[PDB]
Symmetry: C5
């Protein structure tokens, strides 16, 4: 993930221009190899034509080049690329939105599961750990970075996400499927046991816990679905064929013919097809957006930070359910105890941001005395 | 379903170009017959123009070819194709999203339905089987593969989804409508009976169970709706006519005219219309995307694996409600029992994915001592 | 509703071509009259130009025809048609999604409202009938077929959807508004009475019933909103003007001028403007899609089957609440009672659909021993 | 709100053509003033060119006209208009979807709040009136028509929406913000008091009431947000300039130059620029769609009927909570008491709408005896 | 935020043209510097070509300009801008929709947390202050203005948002992540303590409170996610490159070539490239819309008023939970106590907005007596 929100906070002079001097997760880094290959092929063709062709062969090449440059359309490429990239971006944001966060569940567990003793600590930590374990199982199923971190369930046990007992239970339950769903059944059964044992004081609280856990399960299932059901290969191939055929044609169409022949278009013989290179950057970067975002759990610069998410979730959830359980800051009257209209101060840097409240678009409408009179 | 997520995890050199060497669920497999027909017709027309026609007939054909080429437009093909395929893909993903997964309901059943005896086992298994039976009924109504697997309710009984008693009950209830809704009424009544019998300890748990079952029912109803209410046939016919008229026009417009006449835009008689063939591949594959995705429950390569989903759902739900009920791994303190900030290790292959936490885009904003001062 | 899902299950040779032989709900049926009028106008103009006009008038008409062609642009018409039709299709699907299905409510009623006696039968049937009556009231307000079936509340009473007592109560309550909301208040009060009288054992069950009823009410309100708030007449008129101006400009710009004059684009004189007729079919069919779908509750072939929905809902809900209440198939051990991994068989037709489970995209990643070792 | 759903129910001959004869909320009514200004400017320029310019000045004007007509196509007017109007229409429908309806809350109040005496009547009426008061407060903040109806809180008191005591309470609570949120706090506190006083029999019922009230509050907050956060003024200005400069250029580029000069496109002097007027209608009406829908709470013909909504909501909610409380039609066996499959009759006008039930797309699949045999 | 809803309430004459006279948040203010740079470059090139070079160099430059003019195409830039800006606008609206409002939670707290004594006041104020503190923490993480107002937790304490005890607790809990999640755990634990102490009378009320708190937490998490996961930098660079390449090729292809050469499209020398500057306006203004909305929490004119939102939320929530708790206006019969159909009056300015109720689109259908008869 490359963040530039602070850089694009305000629309200043050359706001997006300054972003062109970025390397990580950039168009240059994404397409430099493809551009080098295209440039090498283009100049090899130019040489071959200008040095290894007789007069008749040169005339044939000029006719073919004129025909190729004639038969090239940007409309299909722009349409297909725009629609495909829009679909890929929508799926990318959906996949992020289906990343499970244990915050709601951890707050509920910390609040509801009672007991400051070892048994209560164990119960809360085990519940939050089951949530984290389900999340990590799905994450290592769908993300290459997470899989490389935890290439095996033994690695999961070594990292502390799973205990040897949980590992043995999983191996005993093993089916010929992905077993990322097991920790949710474990969580449901453990919560039912906690309620039956008095640790959870109420079936309403039990239902809230299970609703949060089921929301997490739905998110993990959506992640699995996005991993499994790829965008149609036919659609991907159509977009790729359009984009690549455009520049395969350009390799011959955008060739500087001999100026001596005074062809209408090919009057001035440059050496660098600058506009063709600009088109290459534009279209191939548009395709590279989809190439990078199609699987957002790879190891691209703009791919999600799944390992950091896992670490943060584990630490935060464990802290919330163990250290922060029934550990509140002292409750005392605040600074505005007897002030009906509190007004927090502004600093010098923010004094300009003090704005009058918006009272509605009809606030300033003016009406006459006769107009405002109710009729009988 | 064809999966290439592992192949497109990272945006590497020629990432999408490498996907062009795939056969299953590919543009070639989808449109090779249409392309062969188009090629045959095109070359038949070329041979007729070259041999059969006399001088005047050939001149008339050349004028007709110039006019037909002049009247080929791709804006009012690209526009309609893009909009139609976007609609089809949206409906395709919605149809997948409405595939019922019994995971949430199965966790709820395993937790809530009490009793480790034969009666409890039977009750839990019957509830989960009612859910699975409803899912399979809708799936065999909407999916050709599932129908081929279970072409009759007797087949469903033989497969184990339905018991003979349930089959008899369905026969008794038979109405002149699709009876996929009956298992949900059965589930509601059985849950009420279980709660009245003490197996479910609270109406709150009963309500959670029924909410999950009703979510599954809504998903099945959406599947039925998508099966019944097809995309408007007028819209489909409009798209089909656009594409087919474009290429029928190309059949005459893209003929290679005699170089002897030296017309403005041919000047060179190749035998293969390479750009016309590329356009055919592009546009016909764009159409074939919608052709394959319009019914995602057929037997295409990229259609959903409904039979695998059915088998997996049956296995997982039965295991969860039968063997996993009140069967938990031993609860013991974890590896980070007294560690304030757990830090799971990284392997050598994943050490580069360790990142500092993102603290917000305002973290690096710098202010002077006077700027940060609160004002009165 | 025209269904061709079975026909388009698989992407076969000419899958969408086979759909061009359909008449019901087809582009031909939709626009044959408009095409006839356009053809008549075009050929009247052509015959006037060919016979009635003198030499000077014919030269003037040739100038006008050559001048008209530059104003026949397709980019804006395609843009406006695409966006308008996308909006209309989105609204059409939303309108179907707001069609009320009493399945969830009926399952809840059958489960919760207790009593196999006459009083319980009457209570359950009355609740489900209130739901169906509200649905039918909204449907007859918004659908021409349902209105023609039930042109009056007396017709509703005769058809059995309403009792004479309910009709008298509605007439007593009559306000100067659509009274489709009354049955929901009736349902709420009757459910409260049932709970107070012991027929509903718990306020949790009562709340579930009322949540389902309120979901139905929201769907009915959305149907009313779609019926009332039409797409802006300005937008509809703008799209209509675009299409009509395009095709009335074509009436003069697509006339085949005297080939003798040797104008740049009028060498060939075909009596039939095939490409103009193709464009007419394409664009007027695109507009006819919106014309048919703008009101999905009319009597078009692709309009919804509201009458069938009403009949099916009544029958299914009555059966579920009355005969299916606490009438369950015998609970007995299933086929896989003691089979840890059930495996339903495949028929000869579906044997090829047996697929291995998808374990994730990271399953096949290869790592060395050094790569998989944890670092300290 | 202009409704033409009945007119566009069926896709008949000239369905959208017939809508071109409408005046209210029509393109003519929306843009006749702009069209008159444009016509006046166009013909003033025509007379200036034809009567006030010498030979050289007329030659210069003709060159300018040809230049403008050649370079007019540089305006991305269709693109900008489509992409802007789509957003405007989406926001328009969202704003409608956020209009609060008290139907669900009123049914809940009528059912739950008990007591047929004066105290219960007062309680239910006060709750529903708090809901209506919050709705009307937000509506008068965001709607010009509602503000004109109720230009002050004293007007609200006179209209009966608020009592003098409520007005005094609002004045006492006055903060420098919009006080549309106060009635929701009042509703919550009154519901809590009613529950504590025995008028509400269960905290579950109290929670249902508060959930409905909170949904209404969220809708009102969305209305406030839409009123406050206008569409980007930069975007609106870009679209406005794009549309206006097009016709400003047309004023000179679409003039009829002297036919004596025999310019390529100016051989005929047909005084009226019919195609330019058609373009004006198309583009300016496409912009008028956005101009009318950008604030759907103004006084346009297609703007929402906020005053009618307010009146209807008040009447319906008061009736439902006061007259309809525990006032049900007599409950008796219905027409289909012992009919397993009720079949409501059809009229002569609707007999053709009786259809066979749709049983799925796989229903008609035919398989041999061997294909259907289960395999081992 | 710049609001013009009142100005655009009605679609009046020149409604959108009257917005072109605004400066704040305007296209002029956004792009005047870029336009000045473009002007300087264009006229530098013009002066070089006119009087800097010999005749041979002038011919070379003329050929280069005539070549460049054919490469600038509107469709690709327009499409990329449309898709990118649509994505940016959608994300901008979602970001606003994720702004946390404490109104629902504050009403629930005021209703549910009992006690008019100091303990009750402290409990309610502390809960609402925890909600406001979480909101402010996320807002100062994501918003430049809020960060400038509260550049440190000490600033938060001095402003009254956090007590010294809460600051100490946050320091003791400090983890290497953003700690905005802590107040939600605090809220859960404090609500549990209040329920166990009798201040909250029912676990259902506790669950409602925690549901509202969790909704706020999810909104804050979405704000953090939008702050962290920027739109892909590759996509941003692609759009920027498209725009800049277009307007850099324009710098040479839009030069007014010598009219004496009588080039095909350069017969007039206007000095000022009016249409090129109009295109710059349109496209750079589209890009500036995207640039301004990409980070809606910066300090642009059209960025959100986060500081005002913070102040208003604090004041309103404190008032609601402290002064408005169990403080209701006197309950008395309203104006329409015994009026079956209340009819609030209309003023003279709004009398024209009184409309008849819409009874449905089928209301006016006319049927004969024989048509309306039921068939057997
Ligand atoms: Ca990736
Ligand atoms: Ca298919
Ligand atoms: Ca219709
Ligand atoms: Ca308006
Ligand atoms: Ca900004």
């Amino acid at each position: 993930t490359i963040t530039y929100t602070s850089q694009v906070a305000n629309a200043r002079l050359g706001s997006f221009s300054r972003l062109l001097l970025c390397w990580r997760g950039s168009i240059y880094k994404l397409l430099y190899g493809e551009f080098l290959i295209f440039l090498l092929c283009y100049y090899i063709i130019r040489f071959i034509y200008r040095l290894a062709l007789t007069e008749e062969q040169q005339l044939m090449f000029e006719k073919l080049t004129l025909y190729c440059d004639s038969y090239i359309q940007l409309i299909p490429i722009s349409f297909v690329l725009g629609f495909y990239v829009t679909l890929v971006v929508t799926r990318w944001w959906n996949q992020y939105e289906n990343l499970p966060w244990p915050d709601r569940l951890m707050s509920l567990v910390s609040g509801f599961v009672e007991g400051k003793d070892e048994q209560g600590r164990l119960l809360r930590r085990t519940l939050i750990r089951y949530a984290n374990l389900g999340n990590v199982l799905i994450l290592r199923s769908v993300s290459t970075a997470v899989y490389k971190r935890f290439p095996s369930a033994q690695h999961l046990v070594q990292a502390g996400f799973m205990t040897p007992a949980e590992h043995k239970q999983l191996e005993k339950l093993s089916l010929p499927h992905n077993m990322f769903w097991v920790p949710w059944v474990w969580f449901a059964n453990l919560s039912m046991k906690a309620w039956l044992g008095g640790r959870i004081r109420d079936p309403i609280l039990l239902q809230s816990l299970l609703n949060e856990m089921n929301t997490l399960r739905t998110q993990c299932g959506h992640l699995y679905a996005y991993d499994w059901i790829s965008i149609p290969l036919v659609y991907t191939q159509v977009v790729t064929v359009a984009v690549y055929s455009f520049f395969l044609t350009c390799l011959v169409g955008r060739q500087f013919l001999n100026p001596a022949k005074a062809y209408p278009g090919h009057e001035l013989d440059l050496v660098v097809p600058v506009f063709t290179f600009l088109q290459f950057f534009f279209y191939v970067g548009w395709l590279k957006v989809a190439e990078q975002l199609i699987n957002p759990f790879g190891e691209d610069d703009d791919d999600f930070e799944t390992n950091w998410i896992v670490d943060r979730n584990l630490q935060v959830s464990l802290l919330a359910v163990d250290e922060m359980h029934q550990d509140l800051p002292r409750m005392e009257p605040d600074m505005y105890w007897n002030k009906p209209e509190p007004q927090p101060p502004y600093t010098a840097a923010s004094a300009q941001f003090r704005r009058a409240s918006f009272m509605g678009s009809t606030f300033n409408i003016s009406l006459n005395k006769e107009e405002m009179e109710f009729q009988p």
